[PDB]
């Protein structure tokens, strides 16, 4: 203590004091006199430090500033930390030396500016560390080094957790709304705020609705469940506040749900995937030169089980490499046509072992257990010493090295999963050495025509098939029941992010508490994908829109939710029981008419009693086998059937689609007589809008975004005046099959270039750029560059114009907006952070009175609610008499945080830069009222109270644009600010940095442009 000299400097840092205190203690120090000393130039130079530290001279000599004393320990620090600063003056001074900087001055006005800083930089550092530990229980007296390299990492989680419960809200107030009005008009279930009504907003899109509805969270009359307010909000409340605040404690004793709702969340998962053959859209059905090898993988068999059957082992995720390594690894096939159309080839690769390896583990032992072993027997067979194959050595085994990860050497529990993932493939390199055999056949669109071919073929192609055993997801926790929850209503671009840090803080611990969520959030992801990907493209398919409309048009009437197998027996009953009876030709039947209901008898659940029957004999000469199972064949019939109502509707929209066939137009068009022939075989076909219109993936999924007709606008005019030719007239389309993949290739091979990087790269570059040439890219005249730059120029001017033309920039665009935002929202759940610990931090010094805790209302610091009840009844800490309120204020005054309510966090609503951010307005309202970079620079000025937070946010959020333009991080450690003026700022990003020779790239520049249009327009 210490813990006193902070206690001093707030008195004083409240008072005004500190500053005329500073600003004398250089005049004594004395400040004028050294650059007189020393400052015209240092010497010959000379310019070599050793000369310094006259400052000894300076202050020892001060003359000493007297005697040590007489200001006691408290103003020497003063003294302590300016001569510390006034160091780093000096070390900025000899900056000039070695450069170019001039050299000029530390005028006494500046210098108390600075020292201000630093001085209150020093004492809020400490509050928020003594915070920081009180907060989360730590003990000062004992705390490791460790310790905190293990909450860091949760302290880094938090936030990215955090901004997933803002941003999942910000997903429910786009399908429900207050009931009656309120201060503020967006709901904040997790306030908790639980409150009536609420009600349903515009029922659409049906795409969240469904969702809500499967989930009991609607009666489906369209009013919201019991169960909602109940369970979902008040977990996640009770959730949201496990974190904020940090607890640690009993999971609030029991919880919801008692395993019946944990199935709630399960059903869906399943139900949000196809039939092992409703996707053939892998085009699996090509493999074509190959192969049974498919069919061998259904056959062999298995069964679900109490417990411990593909458990323990690591998910699939860890062995997803090795299997895409080694077809890769192998040189036996060669390099296909741009993918594109290789992405086809290597997604049905992936999606065959991801159910190989299911299938495995689940395997029983198969026929006599020979020849070549079931997966286990070999695993367990590994894992023992000779003669010891047999028991339940994984089992055990796993549990053992959790004992083994528990004790801290941190490579334990990596270590047996290593040893699981390359037995793995050594079990597929021997037994399905084959399966990764590849002719492989025609490289594209010739390989097409065939996908083609199958298309159009109502009749069976005959497409093959994966037999699709059943998912065994589970939900242990209540932690792990939102988070699949919140998955089920985000994107996938929203779960991406929280699943890299439930990955990224898995390998930081060492741990993997967090390894099942990570499963059920790359689970769910890949089920969306897939069902973006297979029934949009030639599913249902696109064309002759003018007719596909009417058909989705006649689409319209009536359907809900996912349904129970007992719940569509008793809807489809005359039908299923007319079906029974036309399949039944004894007259025993006419018994078996009118006493079939009971006489059969949520989900399946099938039985026949038979009781409640009295004519036994009569119906008794139907039998058992043969008739549930064609019922249970009927309701497989049924429920199918009313699952391509689930993509009809839903994906397709009479109203989506006619966006889609009108934006086009407006593109199409001609602007006078002229006909059109470019954008043929681009947007639509040989025939004239007449129409077809091609699919173009981009264009589809970004509609509705809603609104993008904002973000549309950047790309509706470049789209229209760009001389699309890429397919004619073939100049062009040769340029395809050769020239983007020759240039293209030629590149990487001399990006292989190095070793060795120093000067070979330098060297090389001057041998082929200057003198003569060389051949060795042999064919083309690789280097002269005449004939080269000549060459790139054409096929980075078609990549340019098929960007626009694909409508790839509609998907930039949307992900620069959940990614601004996102890295914007963690700065606000950051500050609410570090409010806990400024709050915690002044109580622990005594310098502010807290009556009690007030659980459930998350916000550290009270909110001005009318009138006088504001500091007890609205925040956390109850704060005693407003007197302690009132000095908590100007404490936080002091720093950058104001909490007046003039400006600028508690402005009305949205006008609060923390309201707009944490809503997520940036993504669903860009464009108006105010600026992106205008709300970036109000993030950091908010942030302005720490130093250790400057130019925290600029750079974050800058790294979004890292891969699409270079940036210039030596540009970012000055002092700029973006919104006010400097729209010439950047500079800050430049233009991409293609490759070894430094090619310019394509689209470098529009990006640039792009991105900064992004940033600055405003509506």
């Known amino acids: 203590k210490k813990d006193k000299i902070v206690k001093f400097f707030v008195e004083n840092i409240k008072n005004n004091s500190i500053k005329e205190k500073i600003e004398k203690i250089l005049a004594e120090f004395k400040i004028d006199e050294l650059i007189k000393k020393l400052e015209k130039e240092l010497k010959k130079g000379n310019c070599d430090t050793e000369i310094f530290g006259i400052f ?43 450069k170019i900087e001039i050299e000029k001055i530390l005028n006494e006005s500046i210098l108390s500016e600075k020292i201000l800083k630093r001085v209150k930089q020093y004492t809020l550092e400490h509050i928020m560390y003594l915070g920081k530990l009180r907060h989360n229980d730590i003990d000062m007296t004992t705390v490791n080094t460790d310790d905190f390299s293990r909450l860091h990492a949760k302290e880094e989680l938090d936030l990215e957790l955090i901004t997933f419960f803002a941003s999942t809200n910000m997903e429910l107030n786009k399908i429900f709304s207050r009931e009656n009005i309120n201060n503020d008009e967006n709901i904040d279930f997790f306030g908790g705020d639980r409150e009536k009504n609420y009600v349903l907003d515009k029922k659409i899109l049906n795409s969240k609705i469904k969702i809500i509805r499967d989930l009991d969270f609607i009666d489906n009359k369209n009013n919201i469940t019991n169960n909602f307010i109940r369970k979902f909000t008040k977990i996640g409340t009770n959730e949201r506040n496990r974190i904020l605040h940090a607890i640690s404690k009993e999971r609030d004793l029991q919880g919801t749900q008692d395993d019946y709702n944990k199935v709630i969340n399960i059903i869906q998962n399943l139900k949000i995937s196809d039939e092992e053959v409703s996707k053939a859209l892998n085009l699996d059905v090509v493999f074509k030169d190959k192969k049974n090898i498919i069919t061998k993988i259904n056959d062999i068999k298995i069964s679900e089980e109490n417990n411990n059957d593909i458990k323990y082992l690591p998910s699939f995720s860890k062995v997803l490499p090795e299997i895409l390594n080694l077809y890769r690894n192998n040189p036996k096939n060669e390099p296909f046509d741009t993918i594109e159309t290789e992405k086809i080839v290597l997604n049905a690769l992936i999606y065959v072992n991801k159910e190989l390896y299911k299938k495995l583990i689940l395997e029983d032992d198969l026929e006599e257990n020979e020849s070549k072993n079931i997966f286990l027997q070999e695993l367990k067979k590994t894992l023992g010493n000779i003669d010891e194959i047999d028991e339940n050595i994984i089992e055990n085994y796993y549990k053992n090295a959790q004992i083994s990860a528990s004790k801290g050497n941190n490579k334990a529990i990596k270590k ?27 490289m ?85 994908t897939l069902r973006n990907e297979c029934i949009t493209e030639n599913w249902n398919l696109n064309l002759e829109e003018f007719i596909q409309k009417m058909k989705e048009i006649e689409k319209d009437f009536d359907d809900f939710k996912i ?38 008898i949520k989900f399946e659940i099938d039985k026949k009693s038979n009781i409640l029957q009295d004519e036994q004999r009569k119906l008794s000469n139907i039998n058992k086998k043969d008739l549930k199972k064609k019922v249970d064949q009927y309701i497989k019939d049924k429920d199918q059937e009313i699952k391509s109502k689930i993509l009809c509707r839903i994906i397709f929209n009479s109203d989506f689609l006619k966006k889609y066939k009108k934006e086009i137009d407006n593109l199409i068009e001609d602007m006078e007589s002229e006909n059109e022939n470019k954008f043929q075989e681009i947007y639509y076909p040989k025939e004239r809008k007449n129409e077809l219109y091609i699919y173009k993936k981009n264009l589809f999924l970004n509609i509705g975004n809603p609104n993008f007709d904002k973000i549309y606008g950047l790309i509706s005019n470049d789209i ?41 790269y330098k060297e090389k570059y001057i041998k082929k750029l200057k003198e003569n040439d060389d051949f060795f890219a042999k064919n083309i005249q690789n280097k002269n560059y005449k004939s080269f730059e000549k060459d790139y120029n054409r096929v980075s001017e078609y990549k340019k114009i098929r960007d626009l033309v694909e409508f790839n ?17 963690i700065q606000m759940a950051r500050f609410e952070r570090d409010m806990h610990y400024i709050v915690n931090g002044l109580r622990e010094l005594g310098i502010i009175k807290l009556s009690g805790y007030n659980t459930g209302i998350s916000r550290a610091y009270p909110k001005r609610n009318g009138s006088d009840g504001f500091y007890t009844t609205t925040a956390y800490y109850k704060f005693f008499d407003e007197e302690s309120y009132k000095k908590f204020e100007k404490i936080c005054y002091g720093f950058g945080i104001d909490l007046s309510e003039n400006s600028e966090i508690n402005k009305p609503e949205n006008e609060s830069i923390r309201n707009y951010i ?68 950047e500079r800050l990003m430049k233009p991409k940095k293609v490759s070894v020779l430094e090619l310019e790239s394509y ?17």
């Not at 029981?577 to 078996?592: A, Q, S, V």
């Open 56 to 98: 000894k001279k300076h202050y020892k000599v001060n003359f000493d500033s007297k005697k040590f004393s007489k200001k006691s320990d408290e103003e020497k620090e003063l003294y302590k930390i300016i001569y510390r600063y006034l160091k780093g003056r000096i070390e900025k001074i000899l900056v000039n030396e070695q």
């Open 416 to 442: 047996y999963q290593k040893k699981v993932i390359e037995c793995y493939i050594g079990y597929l390199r021997k037994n399905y050495e084959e399966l990764f055999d590849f002719s492989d056949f025609k």
């Open 444 to 528: 594209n669109i010739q390989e097409i025509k065939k996908q083609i071919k199958d298309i159009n073929d109502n009749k069976t192609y005959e497409r093959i098939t994966v037999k699709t055993s059943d998912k065994t997801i589970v939900i242990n926790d209540d932690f792990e029941y939102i988070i699949s929850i919140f998955a089920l209503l985000n994107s996938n671009a929203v779960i991406n992010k929280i699943r890299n840090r439930f990955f990224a803080t898995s390998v930081w611990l060492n741990t993997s508490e967090y390894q099942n969520i990570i499963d059920i959030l790359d689970e769910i992801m890949q089920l969306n």
């Open 563 to 600: 349904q129970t197998k007992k719940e569509i027996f008793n809807n489809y009953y005359e039908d299923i029981k007319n079906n029974i009876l036309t399949e039944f030709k004894d007259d025993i039947n006419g018994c078996d008419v009118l006493e079939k209901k009971l006489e059969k």
């Open 720 to 760: 229209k005046m760009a001389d699309a030719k890429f397919l004619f007239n073939i100049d062009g389309k040769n340029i395809r099959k050769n020239k983007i993949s020759e240039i293209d290739a030629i590149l990487k091979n001399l990006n292989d270039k190095l070793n060795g990087y120093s000067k070979e």
């Open 809 to 825: 920039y509609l998907n930039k665009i949307e992900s620069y907006l959940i990614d601004i935002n996102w890295k914007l929202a």
């Open 918 to 985: 944490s809503h997520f307005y940036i993504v669903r309202n860009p464009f108006a009222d105010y600026s992106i970079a205008e709300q970036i620079d109000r993030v950091s000025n908010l942030l302005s109270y720490s130093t250790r937070y400057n130019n925290s946010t600029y750079a974050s959020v800058f790294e979004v644009f890292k891969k699409d333009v270079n940036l210039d991080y030596d540009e970012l450690k000055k002092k700029f600010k973006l919104i006010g003026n400097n729209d010439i700022l």
């Open 1003 to 1019: 689209n470098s520049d529009y990006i640039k442009n792009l991105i900064i249009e992004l940033l600055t327009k405003i509506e």
